[PDB]
Amino acid sequence: GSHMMRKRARIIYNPTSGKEQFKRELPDALIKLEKAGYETSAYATEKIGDATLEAERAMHENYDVLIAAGGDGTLNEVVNGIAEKPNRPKLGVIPMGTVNDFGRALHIPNDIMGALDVIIEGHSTKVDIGKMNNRYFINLAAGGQLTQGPFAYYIKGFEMLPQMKAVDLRIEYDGNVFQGEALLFFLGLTNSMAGFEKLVPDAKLDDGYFTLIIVEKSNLAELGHIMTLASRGEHTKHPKVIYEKAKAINISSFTDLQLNVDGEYGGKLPANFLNLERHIDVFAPNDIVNEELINNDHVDDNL
Numbered sequence: 001g002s003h004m005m006r007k008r009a010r011i012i013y014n015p016t017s018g019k020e021q022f023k024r025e026l027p028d029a030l031i032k033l034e035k036a037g038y039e040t041s042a043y044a045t046e047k048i049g050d051a052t053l054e055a056e057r058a059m060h061e062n063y064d065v066l067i068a069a070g071g072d073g074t075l076n077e078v079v080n081g082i083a084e085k086p087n088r089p090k091l092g093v094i095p096m097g098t099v100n101d102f103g104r105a106l107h108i109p110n111d112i113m114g115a116l117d118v119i120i121e122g123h124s125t126k127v128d129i130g131k132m133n134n135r136y137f138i139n140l141a142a143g144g145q146l147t148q149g150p151f152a153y154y155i156k157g158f159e160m161l162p163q164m165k166a167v168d169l170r171i172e173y174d175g176n177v178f179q180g181e182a183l184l185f186f187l188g189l190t191n192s193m194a195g196f197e198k199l200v201p202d203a204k205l206d207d208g209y210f211t212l213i214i215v216e217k218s219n220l221a222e223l224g225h226i227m228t229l230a231s232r233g234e235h236t237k238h239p240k241v242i243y244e245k246a247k248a249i250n251i252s253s254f255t256d257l258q259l260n261v262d263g264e265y266g267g268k269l270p271a272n273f274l275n276l277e278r279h280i281d282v283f284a285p286n287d288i289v290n291e292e293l294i295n296n297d298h299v300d301d302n303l
Ligand SMILES: Nc1ncnc2c1ncn2[C@@H]1O[C@H](COP(=O)(O)OP(=O)(O)O)[C@@H](O)[C@H]1O
Pocket: 014, 015, 016, 017, 018, 045, 046, 047, 048, 049, 050, 069, 070, 071, 072, 073, 074, 075, 077, 096, 097, 098, 099
């Protein structure tokens, strides 16, 4: 009946997220969490950045869990508020977004009560996050320059590749240097988006390495070839597609580059990137072995 001492939960929700269903389900979500032993309060975002500001406040308020209810943008904002701070609360995910790339990476159920079941059962994993200069990200950073835009919206695999103009770049990654013309670079943490079921065949969410993709300057035949290979997940076999794993990545150019970070405009170069290994403790299903995780100790072998 009462298996644990009372805990504290804070729900940070975006009422405009996805189908905009969560707000009406909040009272029933509170009931479920309270019966499970969580004194639960809630905060509704009103604009960009609100979830970050709330997560920052919540750091001083001694919570056991921060539950983020919204899309990747809401999750990104919550992580940005708690990243690199001592005594971080565990993160609960309710994937209420239009796209839920981080949720899919952790096999978070796409229904509210199922997502809550995962949090209540209390099994958690640690995932890498990315630091870019003085901000953080959880899914992907992308960079490149348009010919003669899409860097403000969600990046759907290699679909923007024909739009890219070859630009001379310097990418320093773990002591190695790429110096030359590139159409595009990706720094992946998670491994699935719209255009790729797998950005890379062997990516891990908790290995401390970014998935570094550099697409070099390509002629029209190489472009068509890359696109053909990308459509069946064989893009990393092409000689103009560089794939490396790296922890620290420093990027610069004497020419202008637009940046996209977790599906939103992430400003301008130069950009220093650091993988914060297994930085965020996040509730995950105990009944699914995750192929993108090295550490599956959260999984019960009898399930
Ligand atoms: N009340 C609000 N009205 C409009 N925009 C908001 C509100 N609260 C948060 N936002 C912003 O909307 C963005 C999209 O939220 P997200 O949770 O990613 O949903 P979706 O998956 O639908 O994009 C967030 O990055 C956030 O900055």
